[PDB]
């Protein structure tokens, strides 16, 4: 296979990784994070 094909296959593998890190579904505004984080973090000193 050509070097351009090998580079494209490598980029597809690089995109396949970082999805296998399982960080893609994390959102700082999820209701799950607002259940723990923004519930202990909101009471605060006040």
């Amino acid at each position: 296979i050509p070097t351009a094909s090998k580079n494209q296959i490598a980029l597809i593998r690089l995109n396949w990784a970082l999805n296998k890190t399982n960080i893609n579904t994390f959102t700082d505004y999820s209701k799950r994070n607002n259940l723990w984080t923004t519930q202990k973090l909101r009471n605060q000193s006040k």
């Binding site: 296979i1 094909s5 090998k6 296959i9």
Partner: protein
């Protein structure tokens, strides 16, 4: 040592068996290989009745090599990977097959691989269905050997005539 005869021969009249059209070839043996040509052609109904009545002992289909890109047992070869072994050969799409009768006679037939009535008869009546493996000159594994034997020398007047393809012990 073999014969080197040369004579004028009148070719046989062109036949028409319906299933296989021509066939003149006034020689008993073909060129290239030198094996007896199967001059007899068995029709579809005759093959079916021979399977039903047990007069046909074997059906042998010829094979055709299968394309590497037609193999689903691996990722496609366009993707970078190991070269992978050759896929198993297909049955011949032209349907050419040999029919071995119980009396030793061998006939020719054109039976499509996948025909319902013939396949049903071959399933019920237990006639041996075989596949002729491939030719060495048509095997993709020996394509490199065929190419090297065609594009290189055979003896280079080095020793004498007694071995077969001595690229290990050169000529």
């Amino acid at each position: 040592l073999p014969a080197r005869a040369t004579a004028v021969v009148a070719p046989l009249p062109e036949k028409n068996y319906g299933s296989l059209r021509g066939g003149r070839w006034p020689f008993l043996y073909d060129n290239v290989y030198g094996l007896p040509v199967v001059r007899q052609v068995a029709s579809y109904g005759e093959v079916l009745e021979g399977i039903r009545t047990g007069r046909i002992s074997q059906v042998l289909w010829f094979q055709a090599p299968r394309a590497v890109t037609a193999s689903a047992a691996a990722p496609p070869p366009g993707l970078g990977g190991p070269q992978q072994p050759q896929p198993p050969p297909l049955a011949s799409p032209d349907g050419r097959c040999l029919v071995r009768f119980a009396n030793g006679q061998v006939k020719q037939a054109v039976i499509p691989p996948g025909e319902p009535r013939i396949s049903q008869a071959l399933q019920q009546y237990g006639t041996a269905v075989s596949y002729i493996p491939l030719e060495p000159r048509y095997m993709p594994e020996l394509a490199a050997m065929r190419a090297r034997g065609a594009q290189e020398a055979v003896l280079g007047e080095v020793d004498t005539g007694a071995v077969a393809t001595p690229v290990e012990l050169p000529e």
